[PDB]
triosephosphate isomerase (Trypanosoma brucei brucei), 484 residues
Amino acid sequence: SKPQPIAAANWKCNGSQQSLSELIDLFNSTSINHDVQCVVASTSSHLAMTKERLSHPKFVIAAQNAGNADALASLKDFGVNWIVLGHSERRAYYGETNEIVADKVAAAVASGFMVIACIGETLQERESGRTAVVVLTQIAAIAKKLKKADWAKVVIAYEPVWAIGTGKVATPQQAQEAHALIRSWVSSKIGADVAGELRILYGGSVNGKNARTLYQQRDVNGFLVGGASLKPEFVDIIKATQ
Amino acid sequence: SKPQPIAAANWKCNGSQQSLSELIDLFNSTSINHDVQCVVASTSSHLAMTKERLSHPKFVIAAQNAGNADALASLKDFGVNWIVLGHSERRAYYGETNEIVADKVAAAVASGFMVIACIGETLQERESGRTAVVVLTQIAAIAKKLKKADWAKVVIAYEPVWAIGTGKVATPQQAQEAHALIRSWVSSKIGADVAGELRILYGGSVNGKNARTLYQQRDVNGFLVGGASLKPEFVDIIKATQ
């Protein structure tokens, strides 16, 4: 069946410390009796805080965007071994190419980290019918520096960039397509055993309502919630991974 | 002639305080001999530090969000008089509509803040010939919640969203084209006076090599440097406004 689910919260800067605070308390008070791996990603400025307050047993802490070998080392020593790389806004605003992103992922994985790699196409990419070539080009970049063994440390997060504030809305059905597309290349390129236990999270707009239908999809193994999607309702999202 | 220029650095959390600290030092050490307004906008977290380390007479701190009377009040009391609203990242990832933005802007202005409002179209919009409709719409929204007097606290920052991580590259001429369009509307919609004094900042990829050229345009009044464009060479950018 499906590998172990993953419910990750991608927190960022223009979000308050109090906001981050309240959330952590919520998570702590929450009961999770099912097999799921929760994750709280955070920028550098909050790593210390969430590290000191997050106590839920089904939760782990993760960093975002660490590339430098020294930076990695610190994280490891600081007690953080999960990292989110290749987010849409990183590629767009920080000019993080498939290459740059590939380099990072390899570094992190070498440092013994658990990586969440983000990939996705934009509106113009989809429109022009470049969806396949695009997503595949990305995944290929990454897979170019990993060994078959390294994959056990990799998590894929599909980002429907084409639906990020564009007005477009990705139906649960469309997501499945992307995920299925991704899982194929893997099974075909890396191996079946690999594609089998590989996690493919949905990094689109999710909520309490759609989280259920979304998850009932064959190739959907979790979520990467962020932006305006990140709210107390996150709790509901966790539960949906049943 | 041209109105007083503005050189705004838009700092965001994905980048340690060290990078920020280092930057402040640079800025504090720099010598600016001309009439120019420098600004360092930062996310919540580093607001305190920035305020505690920044000492250059030509600089000012700036927040990046809210309209909540409380938030504004606090900021105002904290010693922050500038604020940045409507950034592409916000409208896209945080679901900030033309109305939300317009509201915020109205709040800040009422609280006696100096506002930097971001407007700009996407690749799809431009490719679809929506450029004029879009930007004009955006600005119209802001304008409708203001009075002729409020404009003195308004600063427009044009974001070539279509040029951000798309492969496309905007030219100083394509910019002047956009800036010229914006100013025109303001001239006929609000008044020549307003239009004449109105500051319009180019908020796209810029460096030490193109800065001067960009500033050479007749409708370009400064810069809103952020993301990868945010390097120590920001100093060069300031000089390009000479």
User: Anything to note?
Assistant: Residues 125 and 173 of chain B are 19 Å apart (CA to CA). The first strand of chain B starts at residue 6 and ends at 10. Chain B has one domain: 1-242. The first helix of chain B runs from residue 17 to 29.
